[PDB]
Amino acid sequence: NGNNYVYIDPTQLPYDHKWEFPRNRLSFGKTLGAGAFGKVVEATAYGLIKSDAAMTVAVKMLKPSAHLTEREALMSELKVLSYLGNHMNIVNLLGACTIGGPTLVITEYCCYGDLLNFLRRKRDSFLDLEDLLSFSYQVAKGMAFLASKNCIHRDLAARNILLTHGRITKICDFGLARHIKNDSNYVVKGNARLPVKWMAPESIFNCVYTFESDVWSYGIFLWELFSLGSSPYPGMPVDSKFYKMIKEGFRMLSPEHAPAEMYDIMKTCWDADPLKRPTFKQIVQLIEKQISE
């Protein structure tokens, strides 16, 4: 009754059927990633674009291990993706299958896989510095787009950036298609397993996920990136001591390969006051103005 202005979230809202696509026009292939309850699969879609009779795509789907909770999560993801719109630097929705079977969410296939692996298998023969400047600019633009659509990414990290042609990087939601009890980057806090080393303190202590929370993670991502795929706070486990250190204001030092301008952005992203952190729009404009330096 009170407060007549109610924000409507695209999750709670009709599924637009312009996305629906015949499940008899998909051929599933090798799995690309799986969690306990879901998986992303490589596939061929026939007649998805009138120019490409057969294009490789990725399909997100649940495993028969999955309950009602998961089935709704996948539909929410589909709905969310359906409202975002397209941008070069995210993985885009191509279509879905809801009628006549389990829900299938069809998105872009990114042939070069994810950025962390790429960075690590390349740590030796060091792809060079300019590619790394390019990736951080592109990820910034992609976060700026998500933020202009009022959207937050609650797991920004090199392991969720994918690589495709034209040297393009794309931000990705891996939800459900990743097993986190097996990954030490995810650690128990409260009920959940979270990526706390990528998380802003206000997110860890006060459970607040703002737009500036993402900017912190972007900072950890830059460190991740210029370290060529190393872990954040390398060697140190997440525990009482860590939380205390983050709270007191201790920060990581510059990676050996970060130019001075980037570490500079890193540091401001990690300001304890969220309000002193740059926005993604500012990061993008900063990288563009300083590109010749």
Ligand X SMILES: CCN(CC)CCNC(=O)c1c(C)[nH]c(/C=C2\C(=O)Nc3ccc(F)cc32)c1C
Binder among 22, 44, 117, 211 for its own copies (CB under 8 A): 211
Measured from the CB of residue 118, what is the shortest distance to ligand X in angstroms? Answer: 9
Measured from the CB of residue 102, what is the shortest distance to its own copies in angstroms? Answer: 16
Tokens standing for residue 99: 């009628």
List of residues 6+ apart from 55 with CB closer than 8 A = 44, 45, 48, 49, 109
Does residue 114 bind ligand X (CB under 6 A)? yes
Binder among 162, 238, 266, 284 for ligand X (CB under 6 A): 162
The option from ligand X, its own copies, none interacting with 292 (CB < 5 to 8 A, set by class) reads its own copies
Q: How far apart are CA 90 and CA 81, in angstroms?
A: 10
User: Is 39 labeled as ligand-binding?
Assistant: yes
User: Is 172 labeled as ligand-binding?
Assistant: no
For β-strands 169-171 and 187-189, DSSP reports them as unpaired
Q: How far apart are CA 293 and CA 166, in angstroms?
A: 24
User: Is 40 labeled as ligand-binding?
Assistant: yes
Measured from the CB of residue 117, what is the shortest distance to its own copies in angstroms? Answer: 18
Environment class of residue 110 by beta-carbon count within 10 Å: exposed (0-12), middle (13-18) or buried (19+)?
Answer: buried
User: What strand order describes the sheet that includes 38-49?
Assistant: 26-34, 38-49, 52-62, 104-108, 93-97
Tokens standing for residue 196: 């706390």
Give the chain's end-to-end CA distance (angstroms, integer): 56
- Using CB under 6 A as the binding rule, the residues of this chain from 13 to 42 that contact ligand X are 32-33, 40
List of residues 6+ apart from 10 with CB closer than 8 A = 79, 80, 82, 83
Measured from the CB of residue 178, what is the shortest distance to ligand X in angstroms? Answer: 8
Which position among 16, 155, 214, 264 bears the catalytic label? Answer: 155
Residue whose Cβ sits closest to ligand X: 113
Binder among 22, 34, 63, 83 for its own copies (CB under 8 A): 83
Does residue 147 bind ligand X (CB under 6 A)? no
Binder among 34, 55, 127, 187 for its own copies (CB under 8 A): 55
Catalytic residue flag (residue 239): no
Does residue 58 bind ligand X (CB under 6 A)? yes
User: Is 36 labeled as ligand-binding?
Assistant: yes
Let me know: does 7 contact 145? Beta carbons within 8 Å: no
Q: How far apart are CA 74 and CA 140, in angstroms?
A: 26
User: Is 35 labeled as ligand-binding?
Assistant: yes
- How far lies 138's CA from each of 37, 107, 168, 273, in Å? 31, 19, 8, 26
The option from its own copies, ligand X, none interacting with 40 (CB < 5 to 8 A, set by class) reads ligand X
Binder among 59, 108, 215, 283 for its own copies (CB under 8 A): 108
Give residue 136's region: left, alpha or beta (phi > 0; psi -120 to 50): alpha
- Using CB under 8 A as the binding rule, the residues of this chain from 164 to 183 that contact its own copies are 164-168, 172-176, 180
Does residue 270 bind its own copies (CB under 8 A)? no
Please identify every residue annotated as catalytic. 155
Which residues fall in the annotated binding site?
Answer: 5, 33-40, 60, 108-114, 159-160, 173
Which residues fall in the annotated binding site for ATP?
Answer: 33-40, 60, 108-114, 159
Binding site for ligand X (CB under 6 A): 32-33, 40, 58, 60, 91, 107-111, 113-114, 162, 172, 174, 177
